[PDB]
Amino acid sequence: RLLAPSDSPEWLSFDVTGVVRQWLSRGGEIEGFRLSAHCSCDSRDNTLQVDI
Amino acid sequence: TCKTIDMELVKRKRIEAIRGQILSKLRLASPPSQGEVPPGPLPEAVLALYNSTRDRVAGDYYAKEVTRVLMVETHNEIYDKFKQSTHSIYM
Amino acid sequence: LSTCKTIDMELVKRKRIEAIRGQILSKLRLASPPSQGEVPPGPLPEAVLALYNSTRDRVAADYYAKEVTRVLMVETHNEIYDKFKQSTHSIYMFFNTSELREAVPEPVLLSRAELRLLRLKLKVEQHVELYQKYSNNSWRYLSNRLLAPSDSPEWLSFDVTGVVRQWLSRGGEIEGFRLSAHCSCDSRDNTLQVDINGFMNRPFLLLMATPLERAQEKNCCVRQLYIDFRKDLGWKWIHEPKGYHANFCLGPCPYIWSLDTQYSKVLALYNQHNPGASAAPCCVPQALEPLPIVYYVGRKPKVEQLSNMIVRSCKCS
Amino acid sequence: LALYNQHNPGASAAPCCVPQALEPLPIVYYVGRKPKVEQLSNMIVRSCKCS
Amino acid sequence: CKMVDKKVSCQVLGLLQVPSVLPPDTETLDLSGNQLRSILASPLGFYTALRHLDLSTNEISFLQPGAFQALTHLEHLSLAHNRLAMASAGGLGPLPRVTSLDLSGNSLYSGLLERLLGEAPSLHTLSLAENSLTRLTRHTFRDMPALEQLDLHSNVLMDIEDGAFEGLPRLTHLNLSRNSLTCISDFSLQQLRVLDLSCNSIEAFQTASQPQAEFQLTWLDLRENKLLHFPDLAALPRLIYLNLSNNLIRLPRPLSQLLNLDLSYNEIELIPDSFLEHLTSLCFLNLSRNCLRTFEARRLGSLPCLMLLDLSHNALETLELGARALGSLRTLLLQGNALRDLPPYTFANLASLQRLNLQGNRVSPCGGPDEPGPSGCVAFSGITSLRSLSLVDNEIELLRAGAFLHTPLTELDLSSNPGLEVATGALGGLEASLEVLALQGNGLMVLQVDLPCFICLKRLNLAENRLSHLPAWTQAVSLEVLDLRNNSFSLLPGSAMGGLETSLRRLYLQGNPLSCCGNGWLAAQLHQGRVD
């Protein structure tokens, strides 16, 4: 996702239905997600400059 | 239910509507003349463009109930095995 | 033979109200309004209101025909080969903006432009992303595709309309894209294992733009209708919301008997009275939005989302 | 039941059978002597719905 | 251009300008199909005595304002299939005496005619068909008190103002077919006599109240529209025609003179009691394809003048036809329905029934007054006025001896009845009257018929059967055509086919397992009279 700059709190949502269906069917004991910052291929590192 | 169908009437109305639609989308007052059209098959560039645009490329009723589930707090095994590094955030 | 002019909507609104009552009761599978006297009187739990508020919140001229034009990627031996030499990370594709502007004279004419590739590799699954050249040194992100394994050559389509419109206006002489594999930071080494031609069916743009020569209250239209459960319907078993805007469509869409030669202006009637060229156009809704309600069943309160209830646009057939 | 995915009775008061998905059509036609390749939209019908 | 006495018939093509070397002694001129681009006043005004000017199929786009005014005797003017929409002002000057003006297919526009059309104090037939008109306001038609035939089909008329026809006090024939109207609020055209609102998109129809003038409409057409109700017709007492085919009408002495009502392809799921009572003087009724569940014309004296009734393809279950009700019904059609059980004398009470089609209804006749048959039968025996009867696709398991005993019908069909088993003497009382027979596709094996006695028999149809043998012919009967395709016959005797040389004109054998060197008589008969 491309998080547009904002001076106020906002709510963002992802569609993860295809994952939760699998979790309900045959999911493990505890499964989760991970929000990460984009990384370019030019041996580059980045930092997640978003507060949650 | 009862019905008023005649397949040929619907087919003919559809064909007439198609004629009008094709003429209208091109904003054509009347179909163009073909007198000054060079003979022979189309130039190969035009055929290539038409082939390129023609082919295909790989590129419920009833109401439902809403439920909410919170995430497991960071007090147990969230930060223990996955520190919230500057790289990423875990849930 | 005076044609009917005045439209009276009271009967129309009454019919809409009864239809909406039937729709509401049907969608819930309640053959009758649910039992209400059992409810514990008083305020609702704060958790139920929190959930309802969360689900109620907000998060996250094409009828005509477009002339088609195709421009091919410049050969590798011009600008591609020297400074942006292909490496294992990425593939560079560059276009000459002169013939690009030649194909579409003005930027506002462009309607859609997409970039085509022909992939050669079959079996290995790979995840790839597309960038746009932004200056002599930088790149920016456009989109990514998750390529699927196959056994035969397949074409590829990327939507690049915005960048092409920007090039037609502010662009330099040579502009280009970059097709690189997807590098997660944990992925130390990543390579572009997919093979495409040219690196005989070079990648190209498929421009669609309206041609320069073709540059330029009774009909079906959405009508406002506010329905109130308390007053209009007399229902007390829905606690929130008190009422919603269930606006409705009204208007006839007469058939247009076509001819081989018609006036210039009258062609604009087809676009708004029979766009689909159906045999009997019917004024139907075009964009629907759902409504969540909070109602009790016996002793338990419920938060349910009823789908496709608000009408936003109406279109003939 | 897939036919009634978009059924909203309280909007039209008379349900009609309408196209659900359409596809475009590319044509080639001469304007005097210059070939032109144009792509008309919403030409063919692939599926229908009640709405 | 071809020249005869006072006629200059210019050829169909190859002309780009009006010829100027021809003399004005001609009286009728034609310029159809040529390539004239515009009409100048000079070469045209040279001719004075003209009574026909056919300018069809040209590229005319600009007209001198005084071009046609100088022609004193111009009595006809056709401008169909031109390009008048590109035009300049004035257009047609005030025409002295014109009785036919044709402007068909000129891509005309609302407001172009009002600047183009001029006063024609003797206009009698105006045609604006195949144009692109869109409205009829009070100023569209003016200054023509002699107009009597207005043609407006294939326009895009969607709206009509209040008094658009106030300036035409003597209009009688009006034509609004294939237009795009959607509703009609009232009717204030007293003298109109032929109204054609076919192929429109009308949804409702209505007339006016408090009639100070008796409306005189007789011919009215409303097919292919989307009417949802039967219009009130108390304001058209002279209506003698009506056509409501393909509408959506559902029924929930204003028509004392209605003469031909057509109501097919609607949704008439049932017939109300009082609907048929007032429709006296009717002669033709068509309720075909309407989903009628039963027909219940029980009241005596209902439809006393009816001459035809089409109830085909309705899925009727029952008929309640009373006695002496339809005293004049001559043709009746009932095909496509599924009629299982009826009273025996349902078709007997009819006074003058002649044709009674019963294809596909599954109605089986019974023996007769003596040697009775099973219950639920239908008595075809006592009808002395029948002349034709089709019984195909009725799955008649068994035929009876006297099912047609007193029905001197000249045509009978029984084809498409698999497993048919024909009783002896079944066609008893038909020997001297029956003229055409048909048994194609029954699958029967033996034809036990009184064939030589069928003196008036003309043609026979026995194809797609398993016929084994036929009684030996003993004379040259009048039978003209015989069919035996897809039969079991492989060798044909000649003595048993006695005669069959004078009257016979076609005796088919194609598709039969005939073998060469075994017929002999076939080789002689093939030589003269019939082939294959």
Numbering used by the authors:
A (entry chain E): 156 to 207
B (entry chain E): 3 to 61, 73 to 104
C (entry chain F): 1 to 60, 72 to 210, 224 to 240, 261 to 361
D (entry chain E): 311 to 361
E (entry chain I): 26 to 112, 116 to 280, 312 to 591
What's the publication's text?
To address mechanisms allowing TGF-β1 to bind to TGF-βRs without release, we use single particle cryogenic electron microscopy (cryo-EM) to study complexes of L-TGF-β1/GARP and αvβ8/L-TGF-β1/GARP in solution. By mixing L-TGF-β1/GARP with recombinant αvβ8 ectodomain (1:1 molar ratio), we obtained anticipated proportions of 1:1 and 2:1 αvβ8:L-TGF-β1/GARP complexes as revealed by mass photometry and single particle cryo-EM. Thus, while we determined structures for both 2:1 and 1:1 αvβ8:L-TGF-β1/GARP complexes, we focused on the 1:1 complex obtaining a structure at 2.5Å resolution. As revealed in this best resolved structure of the trimeric complex, the arm domain of L-TGF-β becomes more stable upon binding to αvβ8, indicated by a reduction of ~15Å2 in B-factor from L-TGF-β/GARP alone, but the straitjacket domain, including lasso loop and the interface of GARP with mature TGF-β, becomes more flexible, with a ~15Å2 increase in B-factor. In the best resolved structures (class 1), we observed minimal changes of L-TGF-β1 in its overall conformation after binding to integrin (GARP: RMSD 1.3Å, 3950 atom pairs; L-TGF-β1 non-integrin binding subunit A: RMSD 1.9Å, 2496 atom pairs; L-TGF-β1 integrin binding subunit B: RMSD 2.0Å, 2398 atom pairs). Rather, there are obvious changes in local resolution of reconstructed maps, and per residue B-factor in refined structures. Thus, binding to αvβ8 not only stabilizes the RGD loop and part of the arm domain that binds to the integrin, but also allosterically induces more flexibility in distal regions of the L-TGF-β1 ring, particularly the lasso loop and straitjacket. For L-TGF-β1, lower basal conformational entropy results in less entropy redistribution towards the lasso domain, insufficient to release mature TGF-β but sufficient to expose it to its receptor.
The prodomain encircles mature TGF-β homodimer in a ring-shaped disulfide linked homodimer “straitjacket”, (latency-associated peptide, LAP), forming L-TGF-β5. Interestingly, both TGF-β1 and -β3 LAPs contain the integrin binding motif RGDLXXL/I and bind to two integrins, αvβ6 and αvβ8, which together account for the majority of TGF-β1, and some of TGF-β3 function, in vivo.
